[PDB]
Design a protein around this ligand. Sequence first.
Ligand SMILES: [K+]
Ligand SMILES: [K+]
Ligand SMILES: [K+]
Ligand SMILES: [Mg+2]
Ligand SMILES: [Mg+2]
Ligand SMILES: [Mg+2]
Ligand SMILES: [Mg+2]
Ligand SMILES: [Mg+2]
Ligand SMILES: [Mg+2]
Ligand SMILES: [Mg+2]
Ligand SMILES: [Mg+2]
Ligand SMILES: [Zn+2]
Lengths: 77, 103, 36, 225, 15, 343, 132
Amino acid sequence: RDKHPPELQVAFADCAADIKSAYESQPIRQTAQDWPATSLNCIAILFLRAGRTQEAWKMLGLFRKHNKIPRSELLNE
Amino acid sequence: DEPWKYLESEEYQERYGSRPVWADYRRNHKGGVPPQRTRKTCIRRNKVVGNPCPICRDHKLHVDFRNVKLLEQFVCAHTGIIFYAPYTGVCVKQHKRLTQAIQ
Amino acid sequence: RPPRRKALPPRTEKMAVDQDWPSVYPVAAPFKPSAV
Amino acid sequence: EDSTDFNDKILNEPLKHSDFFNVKELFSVRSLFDARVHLGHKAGCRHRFMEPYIFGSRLDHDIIDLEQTATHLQLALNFTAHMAYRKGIILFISRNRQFSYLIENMARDCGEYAHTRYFRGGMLTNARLLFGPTVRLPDLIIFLHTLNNIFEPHVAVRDAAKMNIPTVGIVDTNCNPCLITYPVPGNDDSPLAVHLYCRLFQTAITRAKEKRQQVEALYRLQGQK
Amino acid sequence: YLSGEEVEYECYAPD
Amino acid sequence: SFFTKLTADELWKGALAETGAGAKKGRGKRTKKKKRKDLNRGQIIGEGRYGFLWPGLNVPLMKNGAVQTIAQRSKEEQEKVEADMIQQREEWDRKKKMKVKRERGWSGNSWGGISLGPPDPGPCGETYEDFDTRILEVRNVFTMTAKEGRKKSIRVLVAVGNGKGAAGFSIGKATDRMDAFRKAKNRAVHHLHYIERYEDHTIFHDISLRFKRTHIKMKKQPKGYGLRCHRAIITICRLIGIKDMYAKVSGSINMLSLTQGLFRGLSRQETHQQLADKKGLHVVEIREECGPLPIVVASPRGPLRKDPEPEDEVPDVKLDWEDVKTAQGMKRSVWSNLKRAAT
Amino acid sequence: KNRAARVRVSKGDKPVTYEEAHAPHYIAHRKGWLSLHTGNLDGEDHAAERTVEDVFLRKFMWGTFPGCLADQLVLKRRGNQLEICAVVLRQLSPHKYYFLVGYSETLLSYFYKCPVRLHLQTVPSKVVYKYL
RNA sequence: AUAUACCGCCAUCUUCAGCAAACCCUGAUGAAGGCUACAAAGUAAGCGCAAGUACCCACGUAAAGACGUUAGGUCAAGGUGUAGCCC
Ligand SMILES: [K+]
Ligand SMILES: [K+]
Ligand SMILES: [K+]
Ligand SMILES: [Mg+2]
Ligand SMILES: [Mg+2]
Ligand SMILES: [Mg+2]
Ligand SMILES: [Mg+2]
Ligand SMILES: [Mg+2]
Ligand SMILES: [Mg+2]
Ligand SMILES: [Mg+2]
Ligand SMILES: [Mg+2]
Ligand SMILES: [Zn+2]
């Protein structure tokens, strides 16, 4: 929701990573994976603010694969 | 009707790849020196022998003067001579049909 | 495919160094690595 | 983009010059003659593959042709300097115990390695087991004495060739230079000869290491601006 | 020998 | 008695009889052998003859949001379960009966000519997928021992190669044949020769050499000639990448002498460039298919001599009576020039 | 040569547990007892009956938890209580382990007429002491 | 019936100190061989010895004692492969 000091932001990016893994390894993986738009925007924003830009750039593909609208804030950052 | 199509299909490429249809065939015989003639025929009264030759083992391979890509596999590219039947293992019946189709 | 069950972390990791230990082992019980 | 220029300005540039480190100024036929490098063993001890490098026999004592030694020594020092410049691991090997202490100190001073002790079976051909799977072997082995203490070739000469490691070696008139990459015909017994060899290699190696730092530093300063 | 060629995710509370 | 029963491991260790004076020296041979079977393999906890359905053990605990109660399968419904388990047992046996048969070697019972695959990847992430391994000899060696009498070990000879000139061979020794296979093939890739090939299909010139008592005569051949050589030479040549060559092996036909004799001769062949450099002359190839056209195959890198090579009216070269007897037609053999499979 | 309860040297590929790796002469020196009761103390009775019960419980648990036991049972008797401590694997679903615990505790309590408790410790794999 | 199919438990050299996977090297890459301390091709996990422990000590006595040798002993401790008996 908001930016935080670097120490907290790094912690939020380790949690978003574990959440990302949860979305990727859902038990509904047998069926199509449902990646909400808000989840993708937040996970991407948290990587940038943490400095894991490499991971954030990779995720941009998932906006096109699942056809999820990117958020304005994500594009500016 | 269009025998040259089989060699351009995916089934052919999966079974043979880029090697000749006789690459993986081996004659069964006693001794180190094989008999100087191959078997007369692999199809005898509509029944196929246990180890059919490269031509007889695939019913989609048609020896025809228009299927030149198959015929090229039985002619030496460097000398232009037709391989004798023990070279590839084709039965005498199919070797004659190949020799006539090549000519 | 169902995920294989993952063992939880030993509850020793949630114990405080100033806890009431008699509440953990109130009666004679076999040694439990996850609880000691 | 920047790596090709690095390897070209630093690694490939020294290889375009005949004497990039000026190792010819380190010795002369006179300096070698004063160290008694020309003195070889008696004719009865001569190895037949050392005959090309022998000037003659002075009263049944073989004399090593220092004009040839000078050319071979130039090549050996030149190779050694380039390998030190490229940050190669240089290992000194000798079993002559009169000079074990001298050689061990020379290696430590030049920042290299010495093996003057009993050579155990498989140090090179079985190094991964003895040291570990990630062990790095030497890039150059310099033999100040190529014979062991029973007057046979040091086992590391054969094993260095097996491991495709170039060898520099002082080869006296009773030694076999066939498998030594850069042999240097010379006296291996006299303290004056052996001390000279250690100064030349020590100086060549130390000079090449200083040259590598000078070039690198210059290449960085110019890179920023 | 010639006769025959001889012959991941973990999660809590799985359902 | 319930208390006299043992576990399956104890029962199979006894029944199999793998430890004993029979299995010590192979004093017992096994055309019929007791084979271990895992009898708990297809067994489900909770399933018994009576067909009871225990909630939470062999059937689901809750059904339609309510806890199931103890139930028993009907006599008919239980026969199907039993029959289905018997069929699953024969199907499993059929799956083990279906084993992919591997290609044979020089003969059905011979190890020679069989591929062992690529050598194992080295400790430091080294790989040899480009190399193929072929067996040349598998021998049973018998050592008389001070206390244990005649013991049986295996000596294996294998060759490795990548088909692009790099090939080698190594001996392997072990008590087990498959440990010997590992040793030889892994060792062979550390003793690789590089073999020069003319136009990447044949040798540069005729090679005639003797190694101990084994004589090998090899002839340079044109494309399409194939490998008309001793079967072991054929195997080695495919690993090197030679497609066209004739070879004749005479004298002692010792596989090891033949292998190392062959590699010694193939590693000492002078290429056309080496000949041009040595003599400072052009190497000119005359082909009958191209008529009188002179084809320069190699030119000296250094200066080119101006003095022609002396033309000895008659060369003092030693000839092979077999080659001369053939050229004249006096060589008549019922076994020569026989029709054979493509090699 | 002595054989009793000795896992013999092999090629270095056989994993043995701590208990399996210690021969009988190490009993009470490096390894303890798998059952503790008062029947074998001086002046105590009913050692024969405790011994038969122990032999049964080991067979009962081996076949009741087939493929699940990763080590020998530890049998403890205090008063009339019987505690069975087992190291088991993590392959069976937890529902099947709870079923078998409820089933085994009840059946053994009625068989031997004493309160019986079963204590399960799960390990991901058999704990290896050494490779003989 | 078969200990000459075995598990199990043992005798025996042992009142021994050796066995040995995985590597490496020599003999032309033959069957084979691999040690020298002022050392010359061997490195060696593991097992045994040793150490440790028991008994009254650190002594002694127990215990321990590998691999292998004798198709050593035992199918009659029990179990069990194969074969045989089932009025
Ligand atoms: K026995
Ligand atoms: K018995
Ligand atoms: K029996
Ligand atoms: Mg000397
Ligand atoms: Mg056969
Ligand atoms: Mg005894
Ligand atoms: Mg016996
Ligand atoms: Mg004592
Ligand atoms: Mg005793
Ligand atoms: Mg002891
Ligand atoms: Mg007997
Ligand atoms: Zn046919």
